Amino acid sequence: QSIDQLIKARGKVYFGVATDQNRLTTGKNAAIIKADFGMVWPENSMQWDATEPSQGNFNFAGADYLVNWAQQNGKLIGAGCLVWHSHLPSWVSSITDKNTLINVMKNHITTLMTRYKGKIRTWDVVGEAFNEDGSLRQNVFLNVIGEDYIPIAFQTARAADPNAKLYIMDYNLDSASYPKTQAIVNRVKQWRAAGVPIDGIGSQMHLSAGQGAGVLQALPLLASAGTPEVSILMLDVAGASPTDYVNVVNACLNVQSCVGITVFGVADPDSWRASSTPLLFDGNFNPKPAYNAIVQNLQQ
Amino acid sequence: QSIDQLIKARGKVYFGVATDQNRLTTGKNAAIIKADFGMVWPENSMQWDATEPSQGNFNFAGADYLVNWAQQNGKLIGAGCLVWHSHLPSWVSSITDKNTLINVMKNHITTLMTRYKGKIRTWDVVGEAFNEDGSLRQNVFLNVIGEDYIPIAFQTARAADPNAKLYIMDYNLDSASYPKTQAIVNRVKQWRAAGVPIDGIGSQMHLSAGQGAGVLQALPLLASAGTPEVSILMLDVAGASPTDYVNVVNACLNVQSCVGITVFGVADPDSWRASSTPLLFDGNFNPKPAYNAIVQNLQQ
């Protein structure tokens, strides 16, 4: 059975997966995505270092391929991340003038979002903006522009494509007792009260064995920020225990504003941490017990 | 052991593999390439649709990543294909004016080769130029320019980077009686007699089970064209039988002008025909029997 069909039958929007051109032309990835998943994301083809490697020199061939494939095959598209320190080319980090950096950030956002206007359901606008202690991460945008870079990014994104859901994304939001989880909730509440158009919080979830249970309490906490949506992004789980995966799916089901889940690839050998075998399909493209456990859970 | 070190000890230049950025950051590909292979090729990041998706406007982020990684890790680099019909954006195929298409083709060749001047050992300049019956394939270049497009392409490439070895590449050159094999020999001899700088023939070798034996006769026939070099390119073998792979390696060893072999990826799940398990490593990144058979053949 298709986990995307089953999660839609329980009132959610999608079960999705990250992919890109050379996955779709190799292995069994295209066949599995067509049958079992409802939304694709670019693994890497939309990141800043892939799309604007030097100023004004936009590289769209890879992202175009993915968007086309998804439209032909009737899949939803999510994309990101527009502003994220980790995938930033050096030409951006070396800018020290505030007005320049604001315009460079705006141009990057507007150019990417305009190109795909109306085709992208969800955009990750700002990523990994918090330190582990809950303070704001001192990336180039915070250092040069200040804390208004976040309002500016979201305002710019809303103007570029008013149809898209705009998300802030972070990782290590997997425990309700962790300071970072509480901090992002408090800051998003205050940004939204001031009119910043943040539609969603996306939890980048790279879990160790046994950490699924904690998400049952972390996800409701993220939802308490009052955004229209929350989601689970680029999920994988070391060891791929059915218990961990089922717990994450049940957290999604329990939180009414959680629209769906995106796993971080199809088959284990194509994972960034392949030795931990953390995905739902094995190296022979066979479903693993965690896939069947999700199916069972969604049927009941 | 490393098959690249062992083939070097037998007097050849390399045992290589096709890869690209997202392979180097996932699975065990980087570790295996570092240990076992001596030359990397771009799986897709140098093709025309990836590098010049609109006229005069280039996308080099993916190719730059590969070239940098290879230099950092002491690997040789091969690249291609500059002029192929199968990877051509629609804007090129629509051109109907001979001078315009010549200029477009020359600009494509010169821009890519200049960017990496001196860094690339082998360039595939023209690919898949022949029909199965041995006549020239009627692609946009033949239809608009005529059969001079091949001389022009090679002369332009030689001027752009004199260091590089320049190859023509085709598939189904695997049997010595097949018409395409003799046809490429006939034409390459003619072109070289006219001073066209074709340094090599690359045989793009996608074999079915049992076809390795015929390569022992086909590869020397290709070498009879008199090019300085021949190579085996983008090799895979349905079923990955040790007998097939050993026969291909021995054909390389038997042909003095054959400089090396490149396989079409590391592990079976990342093959374009994964259900035929045609590569040297399995879905858990373990060497397969064919890998060990090549090791022993090269030591004996």
Residue numbers in the entry:
A (entry chain B), B (entry chain A): 4 to 303
What do the authors report?
HG3.17 was evolved from HG3, a higher-activity mutant (S265T) of the in silico design HG2 that was engineered post-design to reduce the active-site conformational heterogeneity observed by molecular dynamics analysis of HG25.
From HG3 to HG3.14, the unbound state is never pre-organized for catalysis as both Trp44 and Met237 adopt conformations that would prevent the productive binding of the transition state. From HG3.7 to HG3.17, no further changes in catalytic residues occurred during evolution. Yet, catalytic efficiency increased by approximately fivefold.
